Amino acid sequence: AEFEKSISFDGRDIRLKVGLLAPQAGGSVLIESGDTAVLVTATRSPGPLTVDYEERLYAAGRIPKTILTSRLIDRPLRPLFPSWLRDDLQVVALTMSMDEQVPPDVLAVTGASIATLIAKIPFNGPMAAVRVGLVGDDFIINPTYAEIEAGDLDLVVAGSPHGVIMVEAGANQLPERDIIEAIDFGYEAVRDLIKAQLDLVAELGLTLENYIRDRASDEIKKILAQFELTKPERDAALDVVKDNIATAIAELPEEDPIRLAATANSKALGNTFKDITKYFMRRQIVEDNVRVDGRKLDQVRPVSSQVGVLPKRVHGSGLFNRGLTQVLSACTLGTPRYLHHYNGALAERAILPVLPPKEQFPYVIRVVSEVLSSNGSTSMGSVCGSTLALMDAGVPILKPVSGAAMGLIKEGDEVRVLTDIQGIEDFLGDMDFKVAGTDAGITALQMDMKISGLSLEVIAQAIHQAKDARLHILDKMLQTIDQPRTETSPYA
Amino acid sequence: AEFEKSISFDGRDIRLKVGLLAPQAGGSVLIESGDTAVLVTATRSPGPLTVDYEERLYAAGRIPKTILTSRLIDRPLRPLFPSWLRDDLQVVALTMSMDEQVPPDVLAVTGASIATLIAKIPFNGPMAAVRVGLVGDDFIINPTYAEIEAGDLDLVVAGSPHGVIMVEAGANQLPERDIIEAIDFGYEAVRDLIKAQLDLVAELGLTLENYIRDRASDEIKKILAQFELTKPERDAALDVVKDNIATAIAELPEEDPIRLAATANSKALGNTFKDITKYFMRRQIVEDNVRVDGRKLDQVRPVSSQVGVLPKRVHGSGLFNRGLTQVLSACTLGTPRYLHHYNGALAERAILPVLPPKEQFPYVIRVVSEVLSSNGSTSMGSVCGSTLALMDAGVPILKPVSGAAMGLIKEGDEVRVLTDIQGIEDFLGDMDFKVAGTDAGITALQMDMKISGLSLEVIAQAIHQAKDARLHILDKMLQTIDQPRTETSPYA
Amino acid sequence: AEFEKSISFDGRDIRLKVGLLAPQAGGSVLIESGDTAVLVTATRSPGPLTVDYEERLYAAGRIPKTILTSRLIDRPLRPLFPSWLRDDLQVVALTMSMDEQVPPDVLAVTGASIATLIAKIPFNGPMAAVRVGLVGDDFIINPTYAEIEAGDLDLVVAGSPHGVIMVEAGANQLPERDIIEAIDFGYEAVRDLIKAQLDLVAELGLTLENYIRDRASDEIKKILAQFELTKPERDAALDVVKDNIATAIAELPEEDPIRLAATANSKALGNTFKDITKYFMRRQIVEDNVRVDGRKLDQVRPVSSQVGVLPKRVHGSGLFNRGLTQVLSACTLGTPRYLHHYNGALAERAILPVLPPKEQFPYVIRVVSEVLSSNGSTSMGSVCGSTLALMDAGVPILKPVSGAAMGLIKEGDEVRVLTDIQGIEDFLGDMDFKVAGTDAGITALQMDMKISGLSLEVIAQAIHQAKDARLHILDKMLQTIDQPRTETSPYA
Numbered sequence A, B, C: 001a002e003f004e005k006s007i008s009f010d011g012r013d014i015r016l017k018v019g020l021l022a023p024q025a026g027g028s029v030l031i032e033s034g035d036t037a038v039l040v041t042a043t044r045s046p047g048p049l050t051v052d053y054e055e056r057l058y059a060a061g062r063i064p065k066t067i068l069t070s071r072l073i074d075r076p077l078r079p080l081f082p083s084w085l086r087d088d089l090q091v092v093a094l095t096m097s098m099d100e101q102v103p104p105d106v107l108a109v110t111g112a113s114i115a116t117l118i119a120k121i122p123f124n125g126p127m128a129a130v131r132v133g134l135v136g137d138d139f140i141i142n143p144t145y146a147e148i149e150a151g152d153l154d155l156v157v158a159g160s161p162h163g164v165i166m167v168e169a170g171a172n173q174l175p176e177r178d179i180i181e182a183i184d185f186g187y188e189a190v191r192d193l194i195k196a197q198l199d200l201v202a203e204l205g206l207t208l209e210n211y212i213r214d215r216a217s218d219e220i221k222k223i224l225a226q227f228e229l230t231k232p233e234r235d236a237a238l239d240v241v242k243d244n245i246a247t248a249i250a251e252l253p254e255e256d257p258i259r260l261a262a263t264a265n266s267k268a269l270g271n272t273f274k275d276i277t278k279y280f281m282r283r284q285i286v287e288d289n290v291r292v293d294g295r296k297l298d299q300v301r302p303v304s305s306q307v308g309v310l311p312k313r314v315h316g317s318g319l320f321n322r323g324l325t326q327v328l329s330a331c332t333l334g335t336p337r338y339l340h341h342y343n344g345a346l347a348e349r350a351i352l353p354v355l356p357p358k359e360q361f362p363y364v365i366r367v368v369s370e371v372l373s374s375n376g377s378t379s380m381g382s383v384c385g386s387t388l389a390l391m392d393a394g395v396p397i398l399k400p401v402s403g404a405a406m407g408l409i410k411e412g413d414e415v416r417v418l419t420d421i422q423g424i425e426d427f428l429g430d431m432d433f434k435v436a437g438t439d440a441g442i443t444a445l446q447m448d449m450k451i452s453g454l455s456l457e458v459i460a461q462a463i464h465q466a467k468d469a470r471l472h473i474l475d476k477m478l479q480t481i482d483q484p485r486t487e488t489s490p491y492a
């Protein structure tokens, strides 16, 4: 049966209703704030985490960006479930009323944790998320739409007992110190929601691996230590290692036990393989101070760039290289905006603050980032190329924008922060942290983790190390083009 | 080569053309009435019944609801094929000319049977379907569009030698007696089309189970007899029974014959399991007079309901419960209609007759039924919640509408009619019969069967028993709200 | 790193850029002509040929037929790869700038070959394609859009060292001799692009079968020699042969080697089966002068046709039969064009030249070809039926259009040309060659090959033999309707 609980929370009460709706779900709540309401259920099934968010139109008046809010719920949820879970986990979040003030998206993130705790599914939570804006000089928790439209900051922080799990931000060239303060200010309200989820819990009363390891470990060390090897080559080399192991398992007959224990898991080969590769890259990074391609922990990959790659029809052309990550940006100017597709939100969030006001430049601006090769932050290459293409097209942008992605190896007390991560530094690492911006401050953020979280102290260090990467990449794209062209394209 | 046959049929001749089109199909006919023509083919392939209906736009003038007509053909076809058929059966129906009088949908249903008989595929037919309308006090077979738009009744009856297989109706608060008479009047024209399909046939010249049964039967009795068990629990209990049987089959080695006879059918476990559960629920119902949750054969599940579940932005809110079936209806009012989605046709067919005339209420009315839990007629919960939400929104409806679904166990001479069926009463039963309406009469019908049909006499009894369910559910939703609110929403 | 190469080519230089873009691709080039640029990559992966073409909108000005250009690249590529290739082959072609003169489609075809050679994937190339138009009396290689819109011819020729692999044409009732000359003129520029791809290559420095054969061969001869057997029957007969072979392989236990060599390839049964059937149909055709249904190598299947199959609402009705290939065409006339769908491009390419000028006939013309049975050229049946339906609707077309598909068996020095091919003559043959047109000349072409190519000399013979088929089919559709009706439909 139904139970309300109110939580006093920065002026806007957050109300939870359990026992009201979806009685066949593992756990459920109507989480409500003001007059915004979203229903969040969670169900473990025999079988793996599907999160569907719906924004109903009757919630505001029905007449004849949801996938982003789908990922916003999923990202901080995923790495809190134990890794050995193989049952199906269905999370549904339907927004059923929009108050013209309260945005529902952070409400659904918090409800997802609440609903998983009521379904008493093992996970290392609870988690919560808040939004932080900035009006004048005042940070504000869960601002309305009005402050989002008027203010200088729009960031989401999700955390848990073990720290911050997700950040997602737009900002108007905010300095690192204020971004760090906003993150910290918002993680403290996350903790206030962690408590009172813990209060709700109290209230309502809630063989083969060794085989592979021994055969393959000393082989993986050496590929990981071969710094002259490019990413394609090291991928073809680690594949051959795994292939010979498969051949050895195939050679022995059905009589051996591990062949049956391996035909009982047609994938364990890959999982243990990656886990051995993860371990040896990590020890390579923590004790030795070198990454898998020989670079220092602060070193940025070699950067290349050019302008006007395409004919002057394409109003703006820009090619960017970071190692084997390649992006070609194309700029179109039109008539009666500002948008950008990625074959996207992160880079238009990162470009917008420097786009000139309608008064000066009345074209509608259209940027397409063709990702032609991927090895790290293709979304940061998309930002960098976008700026180049806008400068080739004569768009009088305030400042050029650049960005890089940081990584993290966290081996106990040992913590290392990587700049401009290789793909497998992202796959076998603990953090994917994109930061974009200008000479003056930050414009866009995006953090994903595969562990239960990080302290704010380590986030501050990654944000400081990433300004150096952004500075180095930007101060070397200006050797391709230092100003926007004074004139536009004859076909613009 | 081509052959015509005309059938004299209530004023409108029905013409069939065989040997004309689709010469690689098992069987085919252009069935035509007036100047409406639809081509219906049927092909058995080695491999399971796919029915695709297409309504071409050149049929009426091509310029730059078909899935419902797809189901209308499929539903009365499916349960006439023997259950042991595993070959692929492709039925295609293309409407190739619309006469502005004759609706083609019932033509395609009849052709589907004709085409299956020519392909000489085993099935317990023939079947046919007709439409019945009512103009003034005159029932009429296969009315035009004009009578459908003007009249008081729009029902489809499909039958076969063994009785009626499908009904689908809209009506304007018609009393049960007239609905029963229309069904009977239309089944008699169905029989007139059964004959003359039989005339066409004459013219053209057309080990493991016992193992599972013995291990599991006395176990299934007891779960089925445990009335205090909720539906989730009894589902988790019957699963454990099947799981232990799987474990026992896995325990014995490849040496036993049934393990190979079971690895020859990776599903027979479930089929025999369900067949044992079907048998014991049925004997539970016929000899004992009790259902699986302890209810009498006329008993309706406990009903709950409330109004204004959502904030007053949502112009109308209504939550309905029947056992573990839960529906939340939401009402939106707008400006320059009447429609309803289901996450739909049956409930707008059932609400429409009480919607006020434009003169009084000029808003466009929009209802969304969120099905939050399913255990029986979620479409009838959708009707009930819709009425509640319309009453919360101040829509001055003529009368409130409610509905329930009836079921049938037919064990030979023994026939039992269930009210407000549980899911497995629908899965392991012989009939799913939805009836909706008001204090005065019926508004909407929908019948599906998994057997070859029922006599009209049993249909009359299910329709009478269902008025009692509708009455009980309605007379207990008025204890939540007895009148529409005199005023609308401040945000309407 | 990046390398340009220019190729002097009929006035319009073709420039190639390698080492510039997509550095993780097997091979890549920006191929450019004038200011049209398309990027073409090619990658072999462990696993089968996927070709994706994209036409970006920024290439011309981006604002808020590609599948045909996808097939145009794929068709001449496919049969140049060795048949024993099982690795994945990804070909991507992005058009990144449209010059208002140069059409990019033939550029991507040529780049696909260039990119495969740089990825040094085994294939029997290189290939190239060009477009040929006709302005006045001047053939022109790779015309602009202006000549395409104004001229009389629009054909694509793709070839390789072994001959022509693909043709695709629209034309205004061009005589066979000029079509043959255009093909030959364009294949010579294809050879000029073959060379200078060879110059680039030089520059940059680039048991079970016998079992099945012995069991089944003398059985397949006899089904193939049974001329009174219809296509369905011979398909059911060859299936039984393969089924008994499967039974024999199943009868023997795991002890035999071929059962394990056959459970190592769960498809080799079909492949060897088809390969035996291919061989014996081919020897049936080359030494004996008879096809599998008893027809001569120039014989057209029996043709049937009728007009007004549907009610006079359907402004035009036409049913065409060639053997078991059946098409029903339907004609709609409207108001403020000329298009045709196929349930399409080839038949509107083939009808357009005889459609009357706006001055005389101002309706918008809409033709739908329902393919009701397939055994050969359903697209040529679509042309023939379209003409019939246009004549039933009173459209005053200049001349009626008809067409047929030719085939080829090429057994070494032995070369046989088939008219109006059966399905398996297309599956087990070397060529599918559709030609459509009128009394005066040709209107539409489409050639596919599964071998590395044919000499122009054999193409000239197939084009001459196909005029006879078109003539015979047309001069026998006029015995159904010899003129368009002087008046239109009462419902037109």
Ligand SMILES: [Mg+2]
Residues within 6 Å of the ligand: A426, A432, A448
């Ligand atoms: Mg990532």
Ligand SMILES: [Mg+2]
Residues within 6 Å of the ligand: B426, B432, B448
């Ligand atoms: Mg049902």
Ligand SMILES: [Mg+2]
Residues within 6 Å of the ligand: C426, C432, C448
């Ligand atoms: Mg073909």
